[PDB]
Amino acid sequence: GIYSFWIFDRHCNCIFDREWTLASNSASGTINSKQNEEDAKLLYGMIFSLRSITQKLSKGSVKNDIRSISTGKYRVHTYCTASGLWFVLLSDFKQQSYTQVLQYIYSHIYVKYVSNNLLSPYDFAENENEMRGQGTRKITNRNFISVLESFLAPMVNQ
Amino acid sequence: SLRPCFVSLIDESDKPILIYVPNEMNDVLKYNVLSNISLDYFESALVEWHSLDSKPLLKSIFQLEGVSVFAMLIKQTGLKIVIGFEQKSLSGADDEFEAINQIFETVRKIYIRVKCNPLLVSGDEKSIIKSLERKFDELFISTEVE
Amino acid sequence: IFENSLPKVSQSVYQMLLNEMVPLAMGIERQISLKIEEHHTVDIIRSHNLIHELYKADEEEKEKVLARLRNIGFQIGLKLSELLIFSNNPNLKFKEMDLLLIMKFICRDVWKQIFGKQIDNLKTNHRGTFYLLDYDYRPIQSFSLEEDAKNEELKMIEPFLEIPVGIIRGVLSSLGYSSEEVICLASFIDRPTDRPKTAFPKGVSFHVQVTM
Amino acid sequence: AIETILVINKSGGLIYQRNFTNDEQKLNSNEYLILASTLHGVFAIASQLTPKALQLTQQTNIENTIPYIPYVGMSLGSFKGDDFFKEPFTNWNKSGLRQLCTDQFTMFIYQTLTGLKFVAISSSVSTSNLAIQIADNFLRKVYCLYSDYVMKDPSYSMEMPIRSNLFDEKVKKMVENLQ
Amino acid sequence: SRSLKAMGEEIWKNKTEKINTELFTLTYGSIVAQLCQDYERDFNKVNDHLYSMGYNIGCRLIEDFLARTALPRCENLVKTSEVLSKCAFKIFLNITPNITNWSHNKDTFSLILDENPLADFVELPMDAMKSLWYSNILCGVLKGSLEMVQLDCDVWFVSDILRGDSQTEIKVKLNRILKDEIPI
């Protein structure tokens, strides 16, 4: 199963947050809660600090990137794109290879509803005082939340 | 199919909003007369109304000028709906009646929807009448070509 | 098999170019009345605040922008019969075909080409006018403002819907019925129940009323 | 093929980084110090991040134990017999970073109870689940080798670089058997 | 993994959606014709507006290109040119520009084309020979898209078939690979 889902961008601030907690599909889905903003900063700090290690000790001309971070309890799966968007997800074991899912989440549910969404804006900078990493205006694209929850409900097997 | 010959909807204050007819020149007057007579038919204890699951009840009222007039009322909105059909074009089957009340339900739904706020610059009564005429063209003057 | 033996361009880029023209109309209007390229800088509003401004625009402002966009659509639709995919291969001529067949053309083939699918059902009264419906309407299938904002969505969107009315009020012109004669208005309408739910909150309609 | 190993004494600070590649030596020594420091920072910051689903109730103290595998090491010093240990042993870093998977390598951790950290970088991406067991077993093996050949040594100050000879020439054979 | 030419030849035939090129040309020509006919016939203030159009198209379109192809971040102008000249254009416009006119120590390059689909059979009025480029949206897209992958450059045409040159050419000069932001 999956414990939570987080999206970050090149301006180093979380865009979308969703943690399920309870085993049910329609669990306490505190979508874009202000409660977990400290956890959001904490996790971004983890991923940014630990990306530098593999970014330094690379070989050849591939310039690799992380795929997964494990611990005793949970396991992290990340997709990092040239656009700077990070697609971190906190999940459990017994799903060993998982990057296909994050490529799906980028393929036709973010561009299909967040960057083909002329009403909604592209990456939420808004002329300084947020783009450095402290300000917050989040994604609330109705279609994005709806179809994302519908697609990820089966993957919360608990 | 069933072709309504005239449609008329009236509010609580007995205010003619729309007496639309599909498409003779001087028959619009006769439909206006029959609609007003049907409005007269309503406020009375001459025939029973409602008292069936607190639901609206279609019923035939009268026939004149060679067109039979069916009528219906909404208790909880003050809406007063009446439609007249060509007498010769009605067979009187149970399935025919089952189609007629469905027509009443549909036209009631369309009017209730068009009365709603959105896509109205100011909720102008002229625009509301024009839109209602457009949708009453849609319902009864369609063909569904392939 | 001549239909596919011609080069192609990606539907993604074409769709997005077709989409952001309401931003073009609002931008050109605001230019009429800090990014550096040519040593004098060019400013721009980022294609969504333009949308929000056009939503909260004045009445005459909005009417002028819609007229400009409709002119664009008329230009799109004017040269569509001389376009080199209908002139030669398909076996429908353009001698006269008074009504009916012309709307079959614009409804069946033109929509399949301009947009990504064939249309849904149309309706006719045989006197002067036709009604066209589409339940998904591809070029706007990914627009949504916010969760509990199910009223401002259609108001913000209805400027985009003035392009297909442009092509419709076009191609009739130059094939025999002129703009003053033909009047046609595009409006929203909900889908039937037996279709998938989360395509759009409502379908879309067109009300061609050529006078003959 | 574990191409590199290293260790972090108690509070960050590299002490041994003998890298078992044919010939690369791209990374300079001072860079690995910053690498180890930030890695220790990642351990420090990883603890208070677990999702709220599991924190209130764990009910999972049966999977923490690590199964034993007979001859992962070779084919001794203070220990004797064919192999260092046979009884299935227990994890200690129940809420710490364990693995790091990338396109080009995979890094495994073993944290000693007191605070010593053992890092193993292998080019081989071991199905990524049993790989944890393999890595922890081999890491405990080199940890026992360390406890033998680095601490039963007079000329060794605590938490300082390991300037040993038997330790490195023995862990070399230990890795070379594992391929 | 595969060569960038194949990564693009194997996707244009497999997972896209297609339309008629001269339909796309007629649409773009209608837009730019409306620009010209709208206000004062001025050919200078249409150039910057088409540049802005292209900027918005590209800034919104880069996210799709990575999504379908999923390349890494581009670092040097050589790999950037190889990418945008042998997979990106092949995906989008079905054209394969080849590179020419590298400057000293690779501070820029230049794209050259002879089959630009944005205007194919578009021999234009005599008035346009000074300021109107007619394909400014392309360079707008290039700058706006490349701005989103952390490398900053300015793009501008030098030659075009339409104004009476041999083949059309665009210069892409880089300014600085700006660094990533840190939270603090």
Ligand SMILES: *C(=O)CCCCCCCCCCCCCCC
């Ligand atoms: C490394 O990540 C660099 C990637 C290269 C930039 C992507 C360029 C995509 C845009 C191509 C042009 C599309 C057509 C625009 C005109 C409608």
